[PDB]
Design a protein around this ligand. Structure first.
Ligand SMILES: CC(=O)N[C@@H](Cc1ccc(O)cc1)C(=O)N[C@@H](C)P(=O)(O)C[C@@H](CCc1ccccc1)C(=O)O
Ligand SMILES: CC(=O)N[C@@H](Cc1ccc(O)cc1)C(=O)N[C@@H](C)P(=O)(O)C[C@@H](CCc1ccccc1)C(=O)O
Ligand SMILES: [Zn+2]
Ligand SMILES: [Zn+2]
Lengths: 307, 306
């Protein structure tokens, strides 16, 4: 095929997304590369796309989708983002300026075992697919497994729970693989984790009520990003710290990344507000991706202009 | 007829409501249909009454489907209704239960939500009442009861899965049950059936304090899950709601227990997460059968302990 004839307005399987990664790289090999950062619990490769115009470990933007496997609009938007980057580089001046200074890393399927499971067995699967000693229940919540307030209020110690934090921080290879990549890279400037649903744009912390020292800057940037997002279809997002805007969550992704010095640590909750919830119709994939892209541009532009 | 009905498939609201009428027509001296209210969207709310006579005999209340996405519960309820009419006058043990107790069965406790899981969103949980100032719809009917209402274990955020609503009994689906139970006045056991997690629980959900009847309820819980396991080996855990799953305020059996209904229980049926709410139709009848054994255990205890 080609990525020009790929159907961005439908949901795809893991194999189809993985094939898309290869085709995108084959079509754009001086712009895009595919990095394997690990293997999942069940042995599947974990892939990140690196978009770059040169240099050695340039300051970088990290974007990940699908860490909760049932949130299908996120992986679908990720595929759309990947194609959009290759379309706009060298054509759109604003985005070209971003990529001329920063690299972008995009992990489209952050939880491949869960994603496979949502296609084969249980559409509403959330967690990883690891076995837990002393339990028959399967999986750890990858968004409770990070080393930031790990195991504190805002997660469950029950292995059968949707928010089970796991036996120890980074027990899940899908999480440890990202941690290892981020620490080895050492020059990640923004980290954006994309989830659905609720229509929120949030910054740290989720595990405690104390505001981050950078709250004023992150709140202003949030306001700018949701303004940009709403400009296209009028989609209304709220924003704030995780703990204020949704609820307390311990061991979650951007609390950790912020603790590593990544100032521009954000998470999106995409469409909708519950009518379809995780079952967002395919006809809403592209509108969701388009409006989200405007918000992403806002954050990346801010990152570019504040070295 | 109810003899040609397919019990091993999931049905629509229309199909279940047709089933109610068929069961009544086929068993006119045993089964009747009572309308206890209308939903927010105007759908009738029906309870089946199984009775062999008397004037407001002591009764068992069983409800399924208060959380609409929990499809194995309504499917099990349909099977229970048929099972009652099959076994009465055939099975000595059950016949003895129904010769003293009435059984009330509410198969679709949240009809608007159930309709919505078929038309629009298979994972819909709440009622379908509108909330001013919010883009979100619906109240969690299992956080809307007047027992620890609005305390820790529920949300004040209208967009939340566990939104408790403006005040206790604000949801007509809940108040309809409250009104019926209070008017009846002789409900001896109240069993709320949910999925999933494979649990049999007793109060409280909203606080850690044990109920005064905890030893009796705990031992009955053990007996019931032992009975359930006897058929396929399905393993249920048991305990108070707050110890066995998590804290939940304004929930159903905390309220019923507070009204003096000692034998207040809730089931979480199959499975433990593999399919979760999406339990295959092939597991409907095994789920219903094993749960029936547990229900029989609770009903016989209720029968023998006024
Ligand atoms: C059925 C349901 O809606 N479940 C929740 C999760 C849940 C379940 C049981 C609980 O007791 C508590 C929470 C969900 O999927 N929510 C999704 C919208 P989310 O799953 O993506 C929300 C997210 C918090 C925000 C966040 C996002 C990224 C990084 C840090 C924080 C979370 O709970 O992980
Ligand atoms: C993802 C998840 O865990 N969802 C929960 C609900 C939920 C969502 C967000 C939260 O923050 C907290 C809870 C669910 O559907 N759970 C079902 C298995 P349940 O929905 O039927 C469990 C039930 C508690 C036990 C109970 C049952 C009957 C009567 C009294 C108590 C509940 O949470 O209402
Ligand atoms: Zn998520
Ligand atoms: Zn439930």
């Amino acid at each position: 095929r080609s990525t020009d004839t790929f159907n961005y307005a439908t949901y795809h399987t893991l194999e189809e997304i993985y094939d898309f990664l290869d085709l995108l790289v084959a079509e754009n090999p001086h712009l895009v590369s595919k990095i394997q950062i690990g293997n999942t619990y069940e042995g599947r490769p974990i892939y990140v796309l690196k978009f770059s115009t040169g240099g050695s470990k340039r300051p970088a933007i990290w974007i990940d989708t699908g860490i909760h496997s049932r949130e299908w609009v996120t992986q679908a938007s990720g595929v759309w983002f990947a194609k959009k980057i290759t379309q706009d580089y060298g054509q759109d001046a604003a985005f070209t300026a971003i990529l001329d200074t920063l690299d972008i890393f995009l992990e489209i399927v952050t939880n491949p075992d869960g994603f496979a499971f949502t296609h084969s067995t249980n559409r509403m699967w959330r967690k990883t697919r690891s076995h837990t000693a002393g339990s028959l229940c399967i999986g750890v919540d990858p968004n409770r497994n990070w080393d930031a307030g790990f195991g504190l209020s805002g997660a469950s110690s029950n292995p059968c729970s949707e928010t089970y934090h796991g036996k120890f921080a980074n027990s899940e290879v899908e999480v440890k693989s990202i941690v290892d990549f981020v620490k080895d890279h050492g020059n990640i400037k923004a980290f954006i984790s994309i989830h659905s649903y609720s229509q929120l744009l949030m910054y740290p912390y989720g595990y405690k009520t104390e505001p981050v020292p950078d709250q004023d800057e992150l709140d202003q940037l949030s306001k700018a990003a949701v303004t940009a997002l709403a400009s296209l279809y009028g989609t209304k997002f709220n924003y704030g710290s995780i703990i204020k805007a949704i609820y307390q969550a311990s061991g979650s992704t951007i609390d950790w990344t912020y603790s590593q010095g990544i100032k521009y640590s954000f998470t999106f909750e995409l469409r909708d507000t519950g009518r379809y919830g995780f079952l967002l119709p395919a006809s809403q994939i592209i509108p969701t991706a388009k409006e989200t892209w405007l918000a992403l541009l806002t954050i990346m532009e801010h990152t570019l202009n504040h070295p």
